[PDB]
């Protein structure tokens, strides 16, 4: 007669129907991705529409069971994971307006072009911003892009912000930022309870420890770019936005040829060594499976080698040609990847297989709990595998590097620098963008000071100065893919923290004596059973307990990150002696 | 010869709730024919030994066949509980017999979906040893009196299996036969070979 058993029966029925409906939707999506045709796309759209209708109907039906009466913790968590409506809280007119605005912004971003050559975003602009080193050749493209796309998305984004705030207030939230920070909200005991507002106090706190390392890296990059840009870089100033190897500056990996510690000793590439031995895609996947089994993880399913498309099809099928790990359900785990015999694809195969091993762990949990702890956890389990499989010690065990090779100091320094140009350089930009979006959604930044505050934060957090003045008529934040299209961006910072946390926790458990970046979890069954303790929980427990089961801490920790680049930190501190670490927020390339 | 071939090498097996029961009496029971039906996922005999089965004689040998999922094969055992051996087919505690189970993905899986096999998920109370329930009445979950329609607090008890070849190893169709031996005071007419 109690509502607890009724809610349990309702959840059982919902899971029983979802394990079939979502499975059919995933199967339709996979069939569409295999051979992109007009009929498969229609089938996928119909399946997705049916699944969304069923989910919203069940959510409207599940809101009649308040969580105060539910005593069982897992049942309450399953009911909470379903009662969340989302965009359905708004009326029909507001929902249609928001959908039309989102589609228009996506179409403008996808069909954007910059001409005074006449190219588009991905074909010509990306290659120019990545490879070209001329000042004007990058400045004109950057200015044209952030003047066309920004001014075309600003009036739509102004209404998009208001519509998202209304949608958030309709879902018992306050702003869109608080709604996006709801994924990190945990519930449990007195020590396993996390709040949304507590996250803002931590993301900043975690940024203070990575500030000296980022300042040293920025000073080193500036000193190395002073050569190629003599009359465009100040000794005590910031760096232009169009001289960061990217249109926005998210990844500084394109600056490796210009910022290299030792050019006389290039990085280690096993492409030719893999081609000489006659390997292929199936060999790479078998080696990845052996690596994942050596650490003490469950074995791959038989369907993974039959139903999954590991190599590019020669039958004329048009695939999107990008790595993806699909979990259709009922024990169906596949990988769709444009796999080749290259080294980057070799590492991506181990990266994507980590997501599969994660999906094969929480399969025993109910359907409403078959997901990672948070948005920064699922992508953190596969990333640590590449960090352990891309070490010079693991390559010699498999047979890619001969036994006569020895680890050199200059090569390790170059590798650490190349990894910091991609992992450390993306944290300040992400933090600044997330803080800006939070303060804009929260109404703290007036709509007449968006660009001013954006470029002011570009100088204090990331240390980037604009080469030309941009008033409030533009919208440069909206020029990013994650900002234009509705998507979260704080997940990358949490992922970057959690990957180093997991790496340290799994390397200290195997009693390894050496550098953190040279760890090797192979031939260590204790490092797999300890990681499986968290992978088998998924979303049935708060993320604090899942993090404590691995590293012991119940919050983010930046100390493992500083220990990963400690030799690189010391090298940068020793090389940046004859310079000023930092940047003044007054220099401007456009000003005389 | 007892018709053991028509039980294991049948053409179409029944559902789990409507488990097909066959009585075996007045025939020589060759317990060596059970083998040869592929590597079996399970050949677990309770209370008896699989070797000395030809050294005894029982009065009646009831054969109960049904198709279930792969993760639910362990639930067909005395004492264990779950979702199959609670409302569909429950085994006695003091069960002296043999449970055989083998995969049948090649025969009982369709690309579009084999929705012919049903299973009972909701019921008022658990079943008794060797009890069958074939009712299709709406499960009255809440106090709201259901009127034959489905919806809130009124769910259908019989659900369908989405058997497809694309499944893994735990959700493929698995055929399970249960041979239960009876030793009543009646004279034994089912002996082994000679
Ligand atoms: C190219 O795409 C078409 C989709 O129209 C595929 O045709 C389907 O193939 C699957 C698997 O055999 C089945 O659903 C049907 O045979 C086809 N469906 C329809 C609606 O016609 C075709 O197989 C793809 N090409 C290749 C080489 O796989
Ligand atoms: C790891 O184990 C494999 C086989 O178990 C063995 O061939 C290899 O030499 C081992 N590596 C180390 C470093 O012990
Ligand atoms: C089952 O019957 C078929 C057809 O009668 C036959 O081909 C097959 O060999 C039989 N199985 C066994 C194990 O004998
Ligand atoms: Zn990815």
Numbering used by the authors:
A (entry chain D): 19 to 134, 140 to 615
B (entry chain A): 335 to 528
Study authors write:
The trimeric spike protein is a major membrane surface glycoprotein of SARS-CoV-2 that mediates the binding to the host receptor ACE2 and subsequent viral entry into cells. Extensive structures of the spike trimer reveal the open and closed conformations for the three RBDs within the spike trimer, where the open “up” RBD conformation is prerequisite for ACE2 binding. Upon ACE2 binding, the spike trimer undergoes conformational changes to expose the FP motif of the S2 subunit to initiate membrane fusion that allows the release of the viral genome into host cells.
To our surprise, we found that mouse ACE2 bound to both Omicron BA.1 and BA.2 spike trimer with high affinity, but no binding to WT spike trimer. To reveal the molecular basis for the high affinity binding of the Omicron BA.2 and BA.1 spike trimer to mouse ACE2, we determined their complex structures. Particularly, Q493R forms three hydrogen bonds with N31 and Q34, and a salt bridge with E35 of mACE2; Q498R forms a salt bridge with D38, and a hydrogen bond with Q42 of mACE2; while N501Y forms extensive π-π stacking interactions with H353 of mACE2. Collectively, our results indicate that the three mutations of Q493R, Q498R, and N501Y in the Omicron RBDs are essential for mACE2 binding. We determined the structures of spike trimers from both BA.1 and BA.2 in complex with mouse ACE2, and our structures elucidated that the three residue mutations Q493R, Q498R, and N501Y are essential for mACE2 binding, suggesting their importance in infections.
